[PDB]
Ligand binder design. Structure first.
Ligand code: SF4
Ligand SMILES: [Zn+2]
Ligand SMILES: [Zn+2]
Lengths: 1063, 431, 381
């Protein structure tokens, strides 16, 4: 008897049953004319271990070579005598094998003969660090049974497998229709060329509610959409589902509405009413068992749905939790811990598709919440029932039916997003190319996907695979660009580097290792990357053929996408520390070569009179400087040619075109995306990335101002017209505000109360908390957390900060002593929202915007450009010290302040040291007399500045956040600490180290007699100052400079350790 | 005027331990061996370049602090696995982190956040809901392990707060078994009255030292207070260094008859010294050849070994700094002292108070407590006390001068291996 | 050997084998880096302009070495200092010139040139001394240079391998990442004493004193009565550099724009602020600082309808030739200029133009700023 079945998933339990692996899949039944789920148990997978012989026998006690050549008979004898019995190994098979090894373990020859020992999986496991007198290392001690099986039988992803001499299980082991057992793994063979079977897909959504008392999420509704024959090689079906079911429950003393049953029946749907959560979960498990989906698709299914399901099953004491999966398990899986939610295998034997992970892999979006995915992929609108409304829906049957329909619509959206992205065909192709388990392909994250490609490649070439473990950025050129902008995709950079330079585990010696010599033949990893690239090229060439079947076109498109994804992901095997194949030298070499390529590309583009306005290992953003799209395409082709000339295997593509671009940061820009319709005509679409304001307490005035500014920027007009229009609108808004023509409703600011107002530590500085406290004091409906406070900043003649002058609108209309603080509404509401978009434009600054609004610019006043104009090292003294506080000394006699900013005061023969005469003409006191006081004041000022620096105040760089905190968070982006108020901008030091260093340098400057004489002072003035009558002043100034010199000598910013730089 | 006419001179305001006679006498530092506690980490004995802190370095130091304390606590409690703080948790998980306030104000039960380390949480934060915790005592910068659940993925709800684990005490060698009991007089600045710069209280204390002949005299700063009204308004006719030199000469020369080992600890309020914590020792004074072996310029904080007895001391007002931020479910000073001992740092508060400059690399290198000290000198603006916290005698002698009126000092007797009663007796006495 | 010296610097020439181990100041670091950058740029310019065996090359290189105080002649404390300079600066520039192969090559070339020059100044005795200290007539230098080059290339590779350790030092990132694009001329932001210029003079200046980059803009402003942002900045700042006062500039621009599609009110509302900022001391340092040649060449490339930039770089060669023909410059000179442009020696091309227009074989200065150009023209009157 031969058992043919198409396998989809595998499960291994190393601790429970050694040497047994379960394969789940489809088996054709003629009695039913349909495919049914089947579980096949493969047992007796023997541990395979490789013992590495030594050159000369070594006495382990002393560690000294005995000089006796070690043949493999010696290793066999040592294993049979010492190792075999010492670890309770009874029966084993030994053999001599020739294997290669080019991985990260010292003292293992590239090619060598090993003793291969195969013994049952029930026997104990040898230590990883096992060593003997005859053998030095032991490989493969912890190899998993599933890995051994897949690599031994050459099973690469889902496929049709034939089983010879299948048996019948004594007792059911799975929740599958058919079961079979194979005693020897050699009985499973890979059939070829047959088509995949259809699969059952179940899209699942559930509504839960948080219990304020038990602090747990109670599943209150579940909706499921089922397609029983879902293709994996054809186009997604229309409609994507055939059947569906829904289950609804009451929320534990939230009784159903009077006529729930009648309404549900009238709806004429497959709705089941459960009187308890326990019954709901039992019904769900029964339905999952009966339907038996091969794929369950959800949103955040790994992280939320499955975890909540298991918690509610073990809380309500629901039997047969394992019906969620396919294997009969008694003990629930351990919590995620470090591995993650996905790597728990709650639904073992079922492929769980989380559209969050799949979307993150296959499509770029502003966010991966379900509503955003619905908006971007399906171009639809998704209605979110607020949490407080779910429990209020149990008042009317209509509301409850609406909630259930919302769950059904969410399931439909999940299935539609899965179908549109073609997640399942792509997962199948990726699994087949890599040769791993499909479940781990759809898990994502750190799950093994390309490690299996490398494992197959190395095993096919007589290698001992390693045991499983147990980037330059061209910073954005912020600004506005009215010319076409070219986006080039460099995702193929690292595979191209590996191919071109022949970087491999076998070609690089393991500081960044030197490049392999050109004489060496291609390595295994470069060969695999080349195979993938050439396969994609062949598939694309076949696709270019005209008059082709659309179905085959879709198949080839999916295959090409899978090949590209695999090729681009290959690098992760070498780069990631958790990788099975982690090789720090190889990753470092690849990164260094990538840096070189990026810098050379920048140089080329610059030589072509174009501008690289952004650059990263994944993309390049170039300023074409052209107003014609045809010339843009020509320049793109020319750039591709110039790059390919210096790097043949680096293949680049154009990822998009922008007609206009306001760029503040990668992921922070506004642009006019260009979609070319052919024949030189295109369509422009606005695209704003990263411009949303996290803070929602903004008056409508500021929101409208920002919207108008963005509209002007994203118009096809030149720069001058845009700036003129912006100035017009800002002046108009300022005049309207000052003339009181603005509707009062547009001054209202709404802010949510996330706590009781008395519980805010910073209540004094918070205006909405002030208004909430006032509201509570009045004696009406007290405002608790979750309430929205509306307020207007009003001037009342109090000389109090704007936070204290916050009033409710009714109070403003009633008191008659309250007026809207127009200055606040123009400086703190409109100006930030407008400058966050207008400041990047060259020629517009915050001061100019303030001037246009009608404010006082006085209150609002790139390294490459600095180098082009002299650099930080060639600044004049005035520019170097223009932000430094000057030395203030109060005269002991008259008490008038003296400001010192230079060593010398006056011109010509009237020039004398500053500390010689008081600034008050009527005062005859000489500060040089009270030099002890000057010394003390200098020390106090130095202490003040050091305290300011060590205060460690941080401000958010975002104008619309400007969060000020003393606490440095451990959460860092590539640019620095991530602001915890908005979670999207970097925290910058208010008083950086450079500021303190420059302040101390300035205090040294204002007492540097010699420097002032040489540089600052003129010729005649120098002559007049280089005589006697000033020697005492010179000595006192030298003493005073000694203090600042002493302080600076203790500063780490003023010293460069050349030993640390050059090594 | 007020200080000179005081009537409660010599009054014993607080007592602890074995009752002693009305008069205390010492060995004049004859059979006395004073050194810095020899631990694995080298001590702070010289100035270190400062004013250059990279945010990355601060991040690394804080993360490794959390990681190291969490590793020790995990080994002690046999905790299996730590879980990322930010991730949702439907079932109970154990999470390691540090406490903080979600805003710049003072911490309260509704403003608590837990920030994880880089190893287990990628530095992510999470709000904390203390409704299900029956008993707790939390301050910012406190490394904690909690069992709790995060059902919404947005608010962590602790159900268990693991207790602190203090370091083991010191096991003295027999080398000092035959040494006699040693007398230690400890006083903290300011040493001059608010309206004078003559150091009258210091003169009285020196007279007391010469009268009683203690074996060690521990003087904690400030010695030239920065907040002194004369200093701030620039009325001094001599440089700060000169005033400090005069004060140190007075102290050292005046104690010559007593032959007492002087241990000088700097303060962040020393207007003449480097304003950075951990504070390096004073280095502007060179004792005469006849006092080199008697004067010990130590760093803030300091761990001293006196005939095997380990004395911890810090000039920083730890209790005032942490009292302003500690939140409890229901003696407050005892709780704060136990927090300091269990965190194993002489300054566990993060962010620090507004009055202390912290160099975080130096903080990592020098603040760690080697062992749990037998005596812990912690001067504070708060009231004087002698408390027994987990077997450590924490002494707050107050400050020698309290504004215009005289203050207090402390005297205690220490012998290694006594009875654990390494502190025979202790008394807070008036000047 | 005054206070802290030693035998670390026996001979003037060295192969730069042992990195320095001292602790220097940030000011010293920056000064040394910039000084050696000036020296290497001077070497490159002299190599392009003259034949390396020529006596003019030797004289000019000696003058540059004396001006920047580098070792060139064959242990007094001062001498020691110079050698230390050389030793540290070199390695600093290594850190600057190892990121990209192009840069590496450039560095190597310049270094080799300098080394050769220095060897040519070694007396036979000294030469032997050198050959001994490093464990080693006309032809010998070649071999020495070969060795040097080998070593230097290796060193640069190593430096490129040790780059991640340096990028974390923000203090040194702005310098090293951009040294190759660092302006090494004089400052023009602070006018101090720029003289008094009447508006009536400006046109005359454009005949002979304005470099082409500015001349073009002037022409555009006098033809279309308007300039785009780029040009507005460039030209206006240039005017500031030549001494136009704020009021003067306001008049100038006013009139010009008023001569088309602009009325006084408009100039007061939209454009005036620009000029004001150009004459202020607040901004991003690109708003009140006259643009240098490099700033004009390597930043803000003009698009169609933009009349700013460097003509020697941003104009098609043929077009440029035509332009030169319009200026009636002798054909041979034109050829020279074009050759220089083909070598990307744009500034040098401009210099040659200067030398032709003023009929001076040697200008006596290195062109790195348009305002400098103007000033020299006026010095020649
Ligand atoms: S080289 Fe300099 S001065 Fe000459 S045209 Fe170019 S930018 Fe102007
Ligand atoms: Zn005066
Ligand atoms: Zn922020």
């Amino acid at each position: 008897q031969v058992f043919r079945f198409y396998w989809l998933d595998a499960y291994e339990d190393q601790y429970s049953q050694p040497g047994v692996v379960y394969l789940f899949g489809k088996v054709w039944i003629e009695s039913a004319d349909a495919y049914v789920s089947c579980c096949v148990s493969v047992k007796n997978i023997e541990r395979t271990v490789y013992l590495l012989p030594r050159e000369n026998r070594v006495q382990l006690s002393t560690g000294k070579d005995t000089g006796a050549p070690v043949s493999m008979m010696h290793v066999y004898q040592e294993f049979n005598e010492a190792v075999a019995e010492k670890y309770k190994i009874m029966k084993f098979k030994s053999k001599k094998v020739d294997k290669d090894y080019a991985f990260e373990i010292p003292d293992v020859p590239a090619s060598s003969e090993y003793l291969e020992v195969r013994y049952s999986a029930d026997s104990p496991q040898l230590p990883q660090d096992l060593k003997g007198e005859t053998f030095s290392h032991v490989f493969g001690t912890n190899t998993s049974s599933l890995e051994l099986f897949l690599l031994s039988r050459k099973i690469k992803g889902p496929s049709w497998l034939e089983i010879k001499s299948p048996q019948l299980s004594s007792q059911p082991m799975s929740w599958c229709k058919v079961e079979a057992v194979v005693t020897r793994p050699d009985q499973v063979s890979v059939v070829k060329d047959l088509a995949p079977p259809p699969v059952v897909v179940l899209s699942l959504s559930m509504k839960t509610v948080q219990n304020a008392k038990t602090h747990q999420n109670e599943i209150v509704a579940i909706a499921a959409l089922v397609h029983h024959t879902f293709p994996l090689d054809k186009a997604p079906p229309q409609p994507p589902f055939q059947t569906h079911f829904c289950v609804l429950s009451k929320l534990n003393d939230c009784i159903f509405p009077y006529d729930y049953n009648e309404a549900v029946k009238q709806k004429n749907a497959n709705i089941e009413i459960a009187l308890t959560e326990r019954t709901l979960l039992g019904f769900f498990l029964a339905k999952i068992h009966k339907i038996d989906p091969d794929v369950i698709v959800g949103h955040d299914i790994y992280g939320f749905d499955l975890e909540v399901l298991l918690q509610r099953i073990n809380s309500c004491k629901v039997p047969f939790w394992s019906k969620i999966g396919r294997l009969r398990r008694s003990v629930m899986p351990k919590l995620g811990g470090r591995s993650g939610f996905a790597e728990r295998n709650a639904a073992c034997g079922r492929i769980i598709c989380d559209i969050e992970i799949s979307a993150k892999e296959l499509i770029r979006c502003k966010s991966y919440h379900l509503s955003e995915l619905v908006h971007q992929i399906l171009k639809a609108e998704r209605v979110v029932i607020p949490p407080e409304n779910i429990r209020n829906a149990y008042n009317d049957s209509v509301h409850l039916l609406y909630m259930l329909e919302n769950t059904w619509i969410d399931a439909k959206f999940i299935l539609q997003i899965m179908c549109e992205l073609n997640v399942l065909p792509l997962a199948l192709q990726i699994t087949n190319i890599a040769g791993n388990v499909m479940s781990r392909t759809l898990m994502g994250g750190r799950s093994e996907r390309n490690e299996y490609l490398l494992l197959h490649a190395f095993t096919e070439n007589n290698f001992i695979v390693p045991d499983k473990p147990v980037g330059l950025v061209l910073e954005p050129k912020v600004g506005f660009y009215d010319k076409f902008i070219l986006l080039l995709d460099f995702n193929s950079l690292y595979p191209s580097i590996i191919q071109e330079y022949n970087i491999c585990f076998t070609t690089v010696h393991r500081e960044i290792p030197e490049l392999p010599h050109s004489d060496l033949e291609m390595g295994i990893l470069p060969r695999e990357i080349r195979k993938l690239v050439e396969r994609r090229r062949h598939v694309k060439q076949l696709m270019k053929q005209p008059d082709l079947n659309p179905d085959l076109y879709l198949q080839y498109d999916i295959r090409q996408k899978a090949l590209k994804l695999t090729a681009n992901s290959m690098y992760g095997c070498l780069g990631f520390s958790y990788s099975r194949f982690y090789a720090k030298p190889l990753a470092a070499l690849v990164t260094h070569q990538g840096r070189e390529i990026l810098l050379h590309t920048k140089e080329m583009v610059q030589k072509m009179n174009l501008e690289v306005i952004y650059g990263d290992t994944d993309s390049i953003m170039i300023n074409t400087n052209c107003n014609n799209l045809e010339e843009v395409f020509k320049l793109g082709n020319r750039v591709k040619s110039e790059i390919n000339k210096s790097y043949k295997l680096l293949e680049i593509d154009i990822d998009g075109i922008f007609k206009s671009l306001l760029l503040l940061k990668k992921k922070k820009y506004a642009a006019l995306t260009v979609e070319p319709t052919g024949d030189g005509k295109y369509v422009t679409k606005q695209e704003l990335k990263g411009l949303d304001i996290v803070r929602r307490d903004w008056c409508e005035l500021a929101k409208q101002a920002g919207n108008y500014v963005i509209s002007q920027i994203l118009s096809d007009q030149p720069r001058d017209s845009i700036v003129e229009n912006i100035q017009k609108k800002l002046t108009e808004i300022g005049e309207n505000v000052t003339n009181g023509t603005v509707p009062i409703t547009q001054y209202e600011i709404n802010k949510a109360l996330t706590k009781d107002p008395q519980d805010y530590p910073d209540k004094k500085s918070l205006p909405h908390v002030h208004v909430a406290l006032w509201i509570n004091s009045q004696g009406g409906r007290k405002v608790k957390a979750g309430d929205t406070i509306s307020y207007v900043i009003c001037q009342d003649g109090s000389n109090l900060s704007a936070s204290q002058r916050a009033y409710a609108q009714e109070q403003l209309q009633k008191q008659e002593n309250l007026s809207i603080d127009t200055q606040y509404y123009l400086s703190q509401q409109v100006h930030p929202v407008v400058a966050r978009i207008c400041e990047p434009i060259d020629g517009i600054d915050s001061a100019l915007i303030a001037m246009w609004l009608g404010l006082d610019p006085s209150q609002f006043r790139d390294e490459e450009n600095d180098a082009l104009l002299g650099g930080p090292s060639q600044l004049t003294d005035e520019e170097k010290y223009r932000d430094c506080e000057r030395f203030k000394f109060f005269c002991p006699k008259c008490g008038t302040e003296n400001i010192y900013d230079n060593v010398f005061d006056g011109s010509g023969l009237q020039i004398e040291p500053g500390l010689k005469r008081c600034s008050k003409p009527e005062c005859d006191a000489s500060p040089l007399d009270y030099v002890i006081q000057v010394h003390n004041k200098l020390l106090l000022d130095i202490r003040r500045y050091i305290k300011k620096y060590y205060s460690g105040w941080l401000v958010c760089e975002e104008k619309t956040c400007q969060n000020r905190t003393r606490r440095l968070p451990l959460s860092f982006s590539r640019n620095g600490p991530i602001c915890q108020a908005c979670s999207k901008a970097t925290l910058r030091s208010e008083y950086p180290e450079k500021a303190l260093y420059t302040q101390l340098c300035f205090y040294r400057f204002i007492f540097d007699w010699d420097y002032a004489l040489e540089k600052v002072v003129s010729e005649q003035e120098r002559g007049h100052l280089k005589k006697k009558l000033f020697q005492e002043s010179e000595n006192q100034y030298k003493k005073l400079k000694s203090t600042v010199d002493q302080v600076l000598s203790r500063s780490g910013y003023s010293e460069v350790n050349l030993s640390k730089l050059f090594q | 005027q007020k200080y000179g006419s005081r009537t409660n001179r010599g009054e014993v305001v607080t007592t602890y331990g074995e009752l002693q006679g009305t008069t205390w006498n010492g060995g004049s530092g004859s059979n006395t061996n004073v050194e810095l506690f020899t631990s694995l980490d080298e001590p702070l004995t010289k100035m270190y370049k400062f004013m250059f802190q990279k945010l990355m370095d601060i991040r690394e130091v804080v993360s490794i602090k959390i990681e190291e304390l969490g590793a020790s606590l995990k080994d002690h409690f046999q905790i299996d696995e730590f879980t990322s703080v930010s991730l949702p948790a439907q079932e109970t998980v154990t999470v390691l982190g540090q406490i903080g306030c979600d805003s710049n104000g003072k911490l309260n039960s509704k403003s608590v956040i837990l920030e994880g380390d880089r190893e287990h949480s990628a530095g992510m934060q999470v709000p904390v809901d203390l409704s299900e915790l029956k008993d707790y005592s939390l301050f910012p910068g406190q490394v904690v392990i909690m069992e709790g659940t995060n059902s919404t993925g947005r608010r962590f709800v602790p159900t268990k707060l693991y207790e602190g684990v203090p370091l083991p005490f010191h096991q003295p060698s027999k080398e000092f078994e035959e040494c006699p009991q040693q007398m230690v007089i400890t006083a903290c600045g300011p040493f001059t009255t608010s309206d004078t710069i003559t150091y009258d209280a210091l003169k009285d204390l020196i007279d007391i030292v010469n009268r009683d002949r203690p074996d060690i005299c521990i003087l904690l700063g400030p010695f030239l207070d920065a907040k002194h009204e004369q200093i701030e308004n620039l009325q001094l006719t001599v440089t700060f260094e000169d005033v400090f030199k005069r004060c140190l000469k007075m102290i050292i020369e005046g104690t010559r008859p007593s032959g007492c080992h002087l241990v000088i600890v700097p303060s962040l309020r020393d207007v003449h010294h480097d304003p950075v914590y951990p504070q390096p020792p004073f280095s502007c004074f060179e004792p005469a050849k006849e006092d080199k072996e008697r004067v010990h310029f130590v760093a803030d904080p300091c761990t001293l070994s006196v005939n095997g007895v380990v004395i911890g001391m810090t000039s920083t007002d730890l209790l005032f700094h942490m009292g302003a931020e500690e939140i409890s479910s229901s003696d407050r000073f005892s709780r704060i002292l136990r927090h300091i001992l269990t965190q194993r740092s002489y300054y566990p508060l993060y962010p620090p108070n507004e009055e202390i400059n912290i160099d975080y690399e130096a903080l990592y290198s020098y603040t760690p407590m080697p062992v749990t000290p037998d005596v812990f000198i912690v001067p504070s603006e708060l009231r004087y006390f002698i408390k027994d916290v987990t077997g450590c005698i924490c002494i707050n002698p107050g400050r020698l001068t309290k504004g215009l009126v005289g203050g207090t000092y402390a005297r205690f007797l220490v012998k290694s291996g006594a009875m654990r009663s390494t502190c025979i007796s202790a008394q807070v006495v008036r000047v | 050997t005054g206070d802290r010296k030693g035998d670390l610097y026996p001979s003037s020439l060295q192969f730069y084998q042992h990195p320095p181990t001292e602790n220097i100041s940030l000011i010293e670091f920056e000064t040394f880096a910039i000084e050696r950058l000036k020296l290497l740029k001077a070497v490159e310019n002299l190599g392009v302009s003259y034949v390396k065996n020529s006596e003019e090359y030797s004289k000019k290189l000696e003058l540059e070495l004396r001006k920047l105080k580098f070792p060139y002649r064959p242990i007094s404390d001062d001498v020691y200092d110079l050698r230390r300079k050389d030793h540290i600066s070199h390695f600093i520039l290594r850190l600057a010139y190892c990121q990209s192969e192009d840069l590496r090559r450039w560095f190597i070339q310049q270094e080799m040139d300098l080394f050769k020059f220095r060897f040519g100044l070694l007396t036979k005795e000294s030469v032997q001394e050198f050959l001994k200290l490093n464990d080693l007539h006309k032809d010998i230098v070649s071999i020495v240079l070969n060795d040097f080059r080998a070593k230097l290339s290796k060193a640069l590779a190593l430096s490129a391998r040790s780059l991640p350790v340096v990028q974390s030092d923000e203090r040194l990132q702005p310098l090293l990442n951009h040294l190759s694009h660092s302006y090494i001329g004089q400052d023009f932001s602070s006018q101090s004493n720029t003289g008094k210029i009447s508006l009536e003079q400006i046109d005359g200046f454009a005949a002979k004193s304005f470099p082409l980059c500015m001349r073009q803009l002037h022409k555009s402003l006098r033809e279309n009565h308007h300039l785009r942002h780029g040009g507005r900045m460039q030209y206006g700042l240039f005017l500031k550099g030549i001494g136009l006062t704020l009021e003067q500039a306001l008049q100038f621009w006013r009139l010009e724009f008023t001569k088309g599609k602009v009325d006084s009110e408009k100039f007061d509302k939209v454009y005036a602020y620009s000029i004001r900022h150009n004459y202020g001391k607040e901004g991003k340092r690109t708003d009140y600082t006259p643009y240098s040649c490099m700033k004009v060449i390597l930043s803000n490339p003009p698009s169609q309808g933009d009349y700013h930039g460097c003509p020697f770089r941003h104009s098609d060669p043929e077009l440029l030739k035509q332009k030169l023909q319009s200026f009636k410059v002798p054909s041979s000179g034109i050829n020279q200029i074009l050759e220089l442009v083909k070598g990307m020696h744009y500034q040098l091309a401009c210099q040659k133009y200067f030398e032709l227009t003023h009929s001076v074989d040697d200008c006596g200065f290195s062109l790195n700023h348009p305002n400098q150009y103007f000033a020299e023209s006026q010095k020649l009157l």
